[PDB]
Point group: none
Chain length 411, copies 4
């Protein structure tokens, strides 16, 4: 089916909303797929959200020209299949992450274990049926699963006070009192999501497996983290090439609980919206060398903040060793650097800070071919698509008002 | 009797705080401990306190641990900040604090029963839950219909641009017709998609402090009952017709949402003298405001957009008009019962938000407040802290504006 | 002669600079009347300044059409005669205030029958006619008669500033008394005042023979240039106010022109004037009338006067804080259309919340003024720069992000 | 006589101003040496600029003692001989550049045997010694010999600017040839160039007889004032480089000073010097030697020269882009310590990302410089504003406020 979406604003005129809503009607598209909301910046405009798929493609082209010239409006055509003259699709609302959440062995250390394979189908099914809004279904984990967690958990906690970054060590005690991070407890995703929610507005979303970098990264734009609920097979408690619950709760969650790290990762996600294939890849590389295997400066020393490092006891000690090569974070080079998932990383990029890395990403995003920019509205949980002079005008007044607050507060 | 205090992680601070509460038989679910957003080094604590020995803890937090502790009392205890809900859920705590033989429905046993029905819906509502739906009777709908038909006809000429900008969407997507009474849960979802405003059914009339405080979270306490059918034109008591036809459309407009949000932010922890001023400001804007549109003036007050007779009086030559200036407006005298003698004109909602902001700076509070739509939390800010969050906020918006100009 | 100007920028490409210059050479326009300079904002563009007059009109249309259709430059045609859909002229640079500084507006004047006074008045006019931007303002020894007139006005007003003037006026007036000879027995020299203004807010003086037009006067405020009279009223009637003598200029305007927030506020009226249609010149002058000239401002507990016409008029300074005037909050869309006379005490004053507020009100008002650009004064080059590109605003936002990045660093 | 200066502010308060002016006056520090101006930020304060010298120094402590104690004002003390517990003096207004503009710095000069040449250097020196801020720069007809020299230097470099000079130099150079008389057959007049500079970035030339101390020279850049020589090197050896004649000033410096980005960058070095300890004056001078004097900058994938020592030296201009030099990326903590030799072609150049990136590196470096305050230049009053941490946040914020308001109005056009 795919997903087609038409992004266009329309000034209110007598009969303006009246006719564009029929412009769908004449072509026979259902008008429960055409949702019309007031523009959030331009007081006199109406923004249209279209929930379409390939069945509607017959008539989309005719509609666009009329809107383009018969009404004089900038129309951006979003398509899932990334075809001639469209922007790669991306959800504009947080509920629209539902639409491909589920869009997802022989050497796995659980290939010949029918209990494990049947267990994995349980978690998959919990994820397949998850929808935005619902609480995350709680699962009692087996005793052998809680020992695997214990094994993973006990060793890593020991290295944190020396190898983990400050943000990580600052938050972890809070997850131990309030979220059941204990050597003997596997935490429930619903408690974690509730905790993140009150910290940075991050929220969890159980996922059956691995999403395409686009889908996964686009979720970061809404501060939605697509999370797995299963656990690695207990035979090899050090296994890491897939992201079990250990990778999630111990590698990602504490940092998603810090504003600057949250704002930084959200920025990688904002940059993915409508990015071409080529640039989703570069963002994935950037992601891999920051959120996944990033190192950060802390005064005169270097600490780890990557999820793949804060979750892998082995490579956490390695990366602080003098053996791995180190480069300062450089996006025009980092985004093109090669990496291998299976082997310990040869190279790590060091970051001045989460804030500085946030700025570099926003800077890098200016290089991403998009006929518009993006800003997340945390009030309606929707993406603002920025392409007008009069929008930037409203944003600038908004900036000016805050400056007045800053100025007045200085006196 | 809450407490708000930050604390640097120095010699085991977090653990000392929790041992300080254990030694005082206070369970850790009444200790919310979060990291600070502007100071990497410290933590934010929030307790929902057990009045006996609260002095023992505060004395320890301030001295032994070197914290700055705000003491928030709802019981108006002198030398305590007037309490306000910090989280959107904390609107549950006092949503049930409302205030009859004159009523046009006094002699009607069924009407006297509906009102109790709607009151209990409001009483039993808690944040997050869907607003319970109700099937309105045929006589409730014609009453709505008489109100709807008579005002709709005045909206093209007498109503402000924003009201008229949004009203076709409510008719198009929320069942705003003369033969249908919309369900609050539908209206609430729409608002959320527009400005993030939410509805919370309320049995009747909360105090100004409680009501205004709700607006800080873009939360509108909204009635669900309808006026009695014998007097359709009766508008005295805030009725569903008041809420959906006078308040709702404006709440869907970003700039009106921000202005009303601003009044509510200003109330958080404001002394009672400043609650009465903000309530008067509210009376003369959100409820009975007029606004300038080029050379003509339109009505935006909910009490005007839901009152047939006073929607036409207000834009007439009979009442006195004054430009909105809050030091004078916040001192005005008004009466609930009659057509208002005086109205205040605003040049724009944008401008009105600025005036409210400036006025709020004069409100005595040992902190500044800023709402966080991500975590649905109001954050209290020392003078130094506010500077860091605005500047960092400013730095973000400018980045977006630099990226977008290309 | 009049005045004609072509405001245009151009990206550098091979021969582009040379093609523009031949186009003007082709048409007798000397290289001294078209200067090219690099653009402040866009590293790769050249800004152009044309010092033309009506003797160039026969040829201007051909040149304009060549810049747009051949060279491909966005061109704003400025005319002082406000021709066929041209922008009303205004000087690009501070030197070019010279060009029309002498365009000036006796029967029942108190100094009519006095031939020494008539002569003094033509002595002061000549100093203005001959003044040119950059020159020291010629000093003149005033007589005892003149310093006694000054003294009568000065005396009555000083006793009244402490209770009637705004705080900013009273903050600076002692400095003028100590460093510019603002005494009852001494008329201060414009050269000293201008030098003190310059060190305070960059504001400078400029002797004018009499009353300029509002466009020309206001335009000077965009450069922080105040066209100032230098004669003094006749000694027969020392409370005579209906002309801006040196008392009105030195006691009404100068203290406030030395305050940064008031300076920026008056400058904002002048920035808004540049190129404004005649309609909006009238509105700006009226706004000027109810702010710079007869304005009042809130000062905490009380309202105080700041208009130059109040601070230099004993009688009306008392009247305006009494219970007789009708006060109104400053709202420009209304105020800009407020009618008034010069003949009597003002029935009605507008109250400004503050100078920084009235400044933002004026910036907001200027956006409504029909112009194909906005403007920014460059105090380094003392030249007006016109903003009409997205390419410019890019740079403008970058520099913003830089100071924000600096202010953030300075806080944390 | 040297130079002492007191920097302090006072809140207005009945009698406060007269009580301050009196403790100067009663100690025979007459009013002409004590300026008092309204504080830009603090609307109830007064700033005081004191013009003093060693003659006052017997009474300085008492005056300071009453200022700090009897009046409660935070007083900074600027001295030119830089005693301990003083701040190395700097000029606060553009006029005080007059004060030490003449503190200048031969048997082997390539002009010692030419008695006409020695005599002429005394003419140019006499123009400069008598030059005062605000005056037009005297125009001097150059000889035909002198013009030959200028042509030899001019012809060879111009044939080489297109492929070796950075974008900014090549952007302005065509304007200088057209409007300032930059030609092979003509030596420009400093007055015409200064007026051009002023119409570009506010820079202005100040005729100077010889070489100033780094402190004095750098400090001038904080006002966008370039102390500039008017003479030309001897005719015999037109490739002679050790002293900065008109060839170095006009062909090496004048183009870049006409560029906004470069102007702001070099000014940032100047603002960094004001009141710096001599240890950091030397660090600044090295940074300057490798940026504005011998700098290279990144320009897309290529690298071009922006240093005046290169842009006025055909021989080393070609060298600096060859494969011979050693190139390091600009890092001011490392740059500021780099050894260098004046006589030979530099073996090592520091590459800048851009003038915009270099400016920020300078400002950051300047933050580490021990100074009891911060400095910003104000082009309206042409005076340096000395500010505390609070005052600095205010100006930064109101500058931001003003500039956003402009972006707001300009967005709707």
């Amino acid at each position: 089916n795919g997903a087609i979406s038409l992004i266009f604003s329309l000034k209110e005129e007598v009969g303006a909303l009246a006719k564009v809503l029929r412009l769908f009607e004449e072509n026979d598209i259902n008008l429960t797929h055409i949702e019309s909301r007031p523009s959030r910046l331009n007081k006199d405009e109406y923004e249209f959200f279209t929930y379409l798929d390939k069945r509607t493609k017959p008539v989309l082209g005719s509609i666009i020209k009329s809107l383009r010239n018969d009404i004089g409006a900038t129309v951006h055509e979003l398509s899932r299949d990334k075809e001639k003259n469209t922007v790669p699709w991306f959800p504009r609302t947080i509920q629209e992450l539902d639409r491909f959440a589920n869009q997802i062995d022989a050497d796995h250390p659980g290939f010949k274990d029918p209990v494990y394979r049947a267990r994995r189908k349980q978690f998959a099914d919990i994820a397949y049926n998850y929808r935005h809004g619902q609480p995350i279904p709680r699962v009692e984990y087996t005793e052998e699963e809680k020992q695997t967690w214990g094994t993973v958990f006990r060793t890593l906690k020991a290295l944190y006070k020396t190898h983990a970054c400050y943000e990580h060590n600052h938050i972890f005690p809070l997850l131990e009192k309030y979220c059941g991070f204990r050597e003997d407890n596997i935490p429930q995703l619903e408690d974690v999501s509730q905790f993140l929610q009150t910290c940075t507005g991050f929220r969890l979303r159980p996922v059956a497996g691995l999403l395409s970098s686009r889908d996964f990264l686009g979720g970061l734009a809404f501060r939605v983290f697509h999370c797995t609920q299963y656990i690695k097979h207990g035979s090899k408690p050090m296994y890491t090439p897939e992201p079990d619950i250990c990778h999630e709760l111990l590698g990602h969650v504490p940092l998603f609980s810090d504003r600057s790290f949250a704002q930084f990762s959200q920025e990688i996600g904002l940059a993915s919206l409508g990015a071409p294939d080529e640039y989703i890849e570069k963002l994935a590389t950037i992601y891999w060398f920051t959120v996944e295997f990033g190192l950060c400066k802390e005064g005169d020393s270097i600490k780890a903040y990557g999820a793949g490092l804060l979750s892998s006891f082995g490579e956490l000690q390695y990366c602080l060793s003098d053996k791995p090569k180190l480069l300062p974070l450089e996006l025009e080079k980092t985004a093109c650097q090669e990496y291998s998932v299976t082997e310990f990383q040869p190279l790590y990029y060091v970051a001045e800070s989460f804030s500085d890395a946030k700025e570099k990403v926003r800077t890098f995003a200016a290089t991403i071919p998009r006929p518009f920019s993006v800003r997340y509205d945390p009030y309606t949980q929707r993406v603002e698509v920025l392409d007008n002079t009069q929008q930037l005008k409203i944003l600038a007044d908004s900036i000016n008002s805050e400056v007045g607050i800053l100025c007045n507060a200085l006196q």
